[PDB]
Amino acid sequence: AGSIPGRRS
Amino acid sequence: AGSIPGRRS
Amino acid sequence: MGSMERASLIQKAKLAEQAERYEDMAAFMKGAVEKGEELSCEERNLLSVAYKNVVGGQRAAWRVLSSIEQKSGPEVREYREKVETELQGVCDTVLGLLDSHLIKEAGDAESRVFYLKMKGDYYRYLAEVATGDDKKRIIDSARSAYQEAMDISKKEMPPTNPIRLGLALNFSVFHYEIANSPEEAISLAKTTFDEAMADLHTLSEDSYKDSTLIMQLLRDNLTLWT
Amino acid sequence: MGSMERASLIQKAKLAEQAERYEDMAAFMKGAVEKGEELSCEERNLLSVAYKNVVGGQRAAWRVLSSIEQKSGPEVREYREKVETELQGVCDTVLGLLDSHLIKEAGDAESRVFYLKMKGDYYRYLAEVATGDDKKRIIDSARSAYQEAMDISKKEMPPTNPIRLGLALNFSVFHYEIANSPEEAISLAKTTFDEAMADLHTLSEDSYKDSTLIMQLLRDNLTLWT
Ligand SMILES: *Cc1ccc([N+](=O)[O-])c(OC(=O)Cc2cccc(OC)c2)c1
Ligand SMILES: *Cc1ccc([N+](=O)[O-])c(OC(=O)Cc2cccc(OC)c2)c1
Ligand SMILES: *Cc1ccc([N+](=O)[O-])c(OC(=O)Cc2cccc(OC)c2)c1
Ligand SMILES: *Cc1ccc([N+](=O)[O-])c(OC(=O)Cc2cccc(OC)c2)c1
Ligand SMILES: *Cc1ccc([N+](=O)[O-])c(OC(=O)Cc2cccc(OC)c2)c1
Ligand SMILES: *Cc1ccc([N+](=O)[O-])c(OC(=O)Cc2cccc(OC)c2)c1
Ligand SMILES: [Cl-]
Ligand SMILES: [Cl-]
Incomplete structure (x- = not known):
């Protein structure tokens, strides 16, 4: 399902 | 302020 | 896009819209305009949606950068200028399609x-x-x-x-x-x-x-x- | 990016994140890696955020196109393949940065x-x-x-x-x-x-x-x- 979103520093 | 959003066909 | 069929460019623009790939959508619709035939109502809408999304992202980025620059080395101004030049280039491309030869x-x-x-x-x-x-x-x-x-x-x-x-x-x-x-x-x-x-x-x-x-x-x- | 200072690339990556210009952010951070110095913790995070956003948009588009293709001329497959090749190229670029020479x-x-x-x-x-x-x-x-x-x-x-x-x-x-x-x-x-x-x-x-x-x-x- 969800990996680390990881899209915001 | 708002023009036509215009971003979806 | 000169080697792709007009109808295939139109189909791919519709797929690019569904995939939220607006730069691709704009490139497909530029290719379709450059075939030289008039656009139908639905094709005009695809052209406008594609470029509105491309230029809308550029404008939003320019406003973020302009705000940081106004609060403020050369980097913020240089990067605002880069985004500004890219935005101007997209607007010139659209204007050039309208002038060659959609309006006339x-x-x-x-x-x-x-x-x-x-x-x-x-x-x-x-x-x-x-x-x-x-x-x-x-x-x-x-x-x-x-x-x-x-x-x-x-x-x-x-x-x-x-x-x-x-x-x-x-x-x-x-x-x-x-x-x-x-x-x-x-x-x-x-x-x-x-x-x-x-x-x-x-x-x-x-x-x-x-x-x-x-x-x-x-x-x-x-x-x-x- | 070879002619831009490392510190200026890092600053521009941070501005590109604020402007939601993730392709630019990834290009700035690739340029910073290619200076050859190790990355700090914050710089590693900038590299990862940039590429996660780029590849995340590609993956989302690939999934949309793959779903349409599975429901389904050659256009949907051709365009899914185009997006797939672009995605593979971004992943190969990241893997190549890790292999030359971040991991070692x-x-x-x-x-x-x-x-x-x-x-x-x-x-x-x-x-x-x-x-x-x-x-x-x-x-x-x-x-x-x-x-x-x-x-x-x-x-x-x-x-x-x-x-x-x-x-x-x-x-x-x-x-x-x-x-x-x-x-x-x-x-x-x-x-x-x-x-x-x-x-x-x-x-x-x-x-x-x-x-x-x-x-x-x-x-x-x-x-x-x-
Ligand atoms: C076995 C187990 C350990 C830990 C946790 N947790 O850390 O939250 C969970 O959570 C669940 O699995 C909940 C769940 C129960 C029934 C159905 C379902 O799927 C819709 C989820 C479990
Ligand atoms: C691989 C990894 C593990 C843990 C963490 N973390 O501590 O958050 C990261 O870094 C991120 O996830 C960066 C991040 C933070 C908030 C939101 C977001 O995108 C929505 C990314 C990485
Ligand atoms: C004069 C006028 C004509 C028509 C309409 N309208 O079609 O909705 C409006 O709406 C408003 O201007 C409302 C308004 C009133 C006071 C303050 C304010 O700004 C926050 C808006 C007006
Ligand atoms: C210039 C113009 C006037 C009126 C209309 N319209 O009838 O909607 C359009 O077309 C669009 O606005 C296309 C559109 C529809 C829904 C959402 C959206 O982006 C959020 C765009 C154009
Ligand atoms: C499918 C396609 C053909 C041609 C072009 N193009 O005009 O280079 C594109 O462009 C894009 O879809 C996306 C893009 C490419 C390079 C840079 C960029 O700036 C962010 C966007 C597509
Ligand atoms: C500032 C900068 C330098 C170099 C490159 N690059 O690697 O070509 C970029 O790329 C982008 O930021 C955005 C982009 C350009 C062309 C196509 C594309 O595909 C959608 C994205 C930026
Ligand atoms: Cl006519
Ligand atoms: Cl080390």
Whole structure:
């Protein structure tokens, strides 16, 4: 399902 | 302020 | 895109819209325009949606960077300038499609008004970032395109036609945000809204929904401006 | 980017993040890596955020197109293939940065684990689109990178360390979605969550907030999987 979103520093 | 959003066909 | 069939470019633009790949969508629709045939109503909408999304992301980034620069080494200015140049290049590409040769071949009011509204819109986006000795000339180019579209729309379309309404909305934004004419913006939005209201009785349920959606945008601006 | 100073590339990556210009951000951070110096913790995070956003948009578009293709002329397949090739090229670029020479110079556990987790992630994104005679080899490359990162993390970091937690989360997703090993996915997420819970008492308020945020993601997956 969800990996680390990881899209915001 | 708002023009036509215009971003979806 | 010269080696791809027109119909395949159109199909791929529709897929790129579904995939939210707007740069691809704009490239497919530029390729379709460059085939040299006139665009249908649905194809005009694909062209406009594609470029509105591309230039909308650029404008949002330019505003973020411009705000940081105004609060503020050379890096913020350099990067704002990079984004600004890219935005200008997209607007010049759209304007060049309209000038070669979409406007000159557009004889029906629906197509001619649509393309002249686009021309006003993309000069307006150029005006948003302009500062040098051409800011005035860019503003006048937007105004002239919107005014010719208005003159045709008032003669050839009912006051509820969605293109006529969206033209008036965007010309009122031009007056308020670019031309420093808030009273002209307010007058145009109010007259447009009132004349559309008085024509709603002529519409089907689905046309009513299309027109009232744009009327609400005029109302939303009037609420912010008054 | 070879003519721009390292510090200016880093500054521009931070501005590109604020402007939501992730392709620019990735290009700035590639330029910074190619200066040849090791990355600080904050610089590693900028590199990862940039490429995660670029590849995340590509993956979302590939999934839209793949769904339309599976429901379905050659256009949908051709355009899915175009997006797939672009996605593969971005993953190969990231993998090439890690191999030349970020991993080999990374000696501290925090940096080495971070880069090996990235290596597993970008092979996992390659595996999502793979079908040919290399699907198995791509899956094994993801597994090997995640396993080496796990082995270092278990020896060198506490069970609440956010990198260790995010590694375990993403390796559990690999087991569930790529390796067809849902029971391994569930076991890893449960053991990771339980061992972190038992170490929360050692943390400050701010470290507690960082660790519990990732623990909630493990819990969210366990809720979907059980
Ligand atoms: C691999 C990894 C594990 C843990 C963490 N973390 O501590 O958050 C990261 O870094 C990020 O996830 C960066 C991030 C933070 C908030 C939002 C977001 O995108 C929505 C990304 C990485
Ligand atoms: C210039 C113009 C006027 C009126 C209309 N319209 O009838 O909607 C359009 O077309 C669009 O606005 C396309 C559109 C529809 C829904 C959402 C959206 O982006 C959010 C765009 C154009
Ligand atoms: C499918 C396609 C053909 C041609 C072009 N193009 O004009 O280069 C594109 O462009 C894009 O879709 C996206 C893009 C490419 C390079 C840079 C960029 O700036 C962000 C966007 C697509
Ligand atoms: C004069 C006028 C005509 C039409 C409409 N409309 O079509 O909705 C409005 O709406 C408003 O201007 C509302 C307003 C009132 C006070 C303050 C304010 O700004 C926050 C908005 C007006
Ligand atoms: C500032 C900068 C330098 C170099 C490059 N590059 O690697 O070509 C970029 O790329 C982009 O930021 C965006 C982009 C350009 C072309 C195509 C594309 O595909 C959508 C994205 C930026
Ligand atoms: C076995 C287990 C351990 C830990 C957690 N957790 O840390 O939250 C969970 O959460 C769930 O699995 C919840 C669940 C129960 C029934 C159905 C379902 O799927 C819709 C989820 C479990
Ligand atoms: Cl014609
Ligand atoms: Cl080192």
